Amino acid sequence: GSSGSSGKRKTKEQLAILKSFFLQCQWARREDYQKLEQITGLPRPEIIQWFGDTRYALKHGQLKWFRDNASGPSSG
Questions:
Q1: What's the fold here for domain 1-76?
Q2: Per the database entry, where does the chain bind DNA?
Q3: Of 12, 16, 25, 13, residue with least CA distance to 51
Q4: What is the spatial distance between Cα 19 and Cα 36, in angstroms, rounded to a whole number?
């Protein structure tokens, strides 16, 4: 449970840095979040929660940037 603070006012720029994270790790730790608040400039509580909601949409298939590969990379 958490206080009644509802806020999702984010900027494409800030979110951009997140979208990249979610992909690398659908879930972030307390040691990683601290960093996100330095690249996105958004409160830890604002980022932590974000990741949660992100999972929902994805599971349903809302995200348009996720699993949106374009090319087929590889290595010999």
A1: Arc Repressor Mutant, subunit A (1.10.10)
A2: 8-62
A3: 25
A4: 11
The residues near 6 (Cβ < 8 Å, ≥ 6 apart) are: none
- For 3-71, the DSSP string reads -S-------HHHHHHHHHHHHH-SS--HHHHHHHHHHT---HHHHHHHHHHHHHHHHHT--SSTT---S
Identify how the structure was determined.
Answer: NMR
Listed by start position, the domains of the chain span 1-76
List of residues 6+ apart from 22 with CB closer than 8 A = 51, 54, 58, 66
Selection from 50, 53, 45 nearest residue 3 by Cα: 45
In 3D space, the residue among 58, 63, 56, 21 whose CA is nearest the CA of residue 38 turns out to be 21
Assigned token pair, 73: 């990379």
